[PDB]
Write an enzyme that holds these catalytic residues in place. Structure first.
Site: not given
Ligand SMILES: C[C@@H](c1cc[n+]([C@@H]2O[C@H](COP(=O)(O)OP(=O)(O)OC[C@H]3O[C@@H](n4cnc5c(N)ncnc54)[C@H](O)[C@@H]3O)[C@@H](O)[C@H]2O)cc1)N(C)C(=O)N[C@@H]1COCC1(F)F
Ligand SMILES: C[C@@H](c1cc[n+]([C@@H]2O[C@H](COP(=O)(O)OP(=O)(O)OC[C@H]3O[C@@H](n4cnc5c(N)ncnc54)[C@H](O)[C@@H]3O)[C@@H](O)[C@H]2O)cc1)N(C)C(=O)N[C@@H]1COCC1(F)F
Lengths: 140, 140
Positions: B9-10, B82
């Site tokens: 969880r980020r 996951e």
């Molecule tokens: C969607 C998101 C994501 C979500 C979850 N996980 C997995 O789930 C666990 C973490 O869960 P959790 O704490 O609840 O994450 P959320 O709060 O849902 O993140 C949502 C936040 O993501 C940002 N956001 C949304 N849309 C995009 C997009 N299209 N492109 C880039 N960023 C995006 C935005 O800032 C938002 O606030 C963990 O195990 C992991 O493996 C992986 C990737 N994503 C593709 C990325 O962050 N991509 C980044 C670019 O490459 C490195 C990277 F991966 F870091």
């Protein structure tokens, strides 16, 4: 005698502080962090001496990390004590910013307000290696 | 093809997740964590395939880490996705407990309640090397 002293707030920066310790050691710096290096004896003396002995003072500004310093005018808070010692010895202070919000100087005790005048490094979760390399540039 | 997938969880586990990555790499494991290995393309398929690709599923249970999974029966939560993938593929699941409180199974969606039946490793700030050595004994 360690090259780098890592000062941090347990409830919010333990993980980053340990992460910083691993990376700096991998790049050849000797690092003091309490959980690895604070050993036997009266800890108040050992901690102060460890700050006085370290060329570099790495300060982990996690969210709210200086909050317990505020109004600590007997200087009983340990981050406050460590910062004042680093300031008083003219150490190379390197703040690492991780979701920290910059306070107004007057909310901090006078003997540590100068810590906000040092250039800080932003911890980037997405570009951690780049963050580490910048920290190493800051270190002596 | 990484041996270890780190799910986390980020807002509460990013630092511990990255610290786990560095230690596992130092001991020779290929690790997937999103900020180092999630690259171009539609990320939904990439993430699920990456879980499928790793023999070991390391789950960082920071405080409240499963809170967004609760009532996520649409399965929109990424930690939920996951875990379900890891359970479905019969992965070697290794929970890392960092101030996590064990919830009653019934607050979690049915497809992920089995995650609570895996033996978890307590993360010890004061004995980190020993914690790491234990994690490695758990890996395959
Ligand atoms: C969607 C998101 C994501 C979500 C979850 N996980 C997995 O789930 C666990 C973490 O869960 P959790 O704490 O609840 O994450 P959320 O709060 O849902 O993140 C949502 C936040 O993501 C940002 N956001 C949304 N849309 C995009 C997009 N299209 N492109 C880039 N960023 C995006 C935005 O800032 C938002 O606030 C963990 O195990 C992991 O493996 C992986 C990737 N994503 C593709 C990325 O962050 N991509 C980044 C670019 O490459 C490195 C990277 F991966 F870091
Ligand atoms: C006193 C405490 C301490 C406090 C602060 N710093 C420095 O100050 C920053 C962190 O400040 P901060 O987030 O505000 O921490 P506190 O809230 O003050 O923690 C207070 C908690 O400490 C526990 N506690 C109290 N009395 C003792 C004692 N006589 N013996 C052992 N433990 C004690 C107890 O659990 C209490 O709740 C950071 O930069 C660091 O270098 C270093 C050491 N201490 C000696 C240890 O932890 N010793 C551990 C055993 O050896 C390695 C060790 F260091 F891990």
């Amino acid at each position: 005698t360690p090259d780098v002293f890592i000062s941090y707030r347990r409830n919010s920066g333990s993980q980053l502080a340990s992460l910083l310790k691993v990376h700096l050691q991998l790049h050849g710096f000797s690092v003091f962090i309490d959980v690895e290096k604070l050993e036997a004896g009266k800890f108040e003396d050992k901690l102060i001496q460890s700050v006085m002995g370290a060329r570099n003072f790495v300060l982990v500004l996690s969210p709210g990390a200086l909050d317990k310093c505020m109004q600590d005018h007997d200087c009983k808070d340990w981050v406050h004590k460590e910062i004042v010692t680093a300031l008083s010895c003219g150490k190379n202070i390197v703040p690492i910013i991780d979701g920290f919000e910059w306070p107004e100087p007057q909310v901090l005790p006078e003997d540590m307000q100068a810590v906000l005048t040092f250039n800080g490094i932003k911890w980037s979760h997405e570009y951690q290696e780049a963050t580490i390399e910048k920290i190493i540039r800051f270190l002596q």
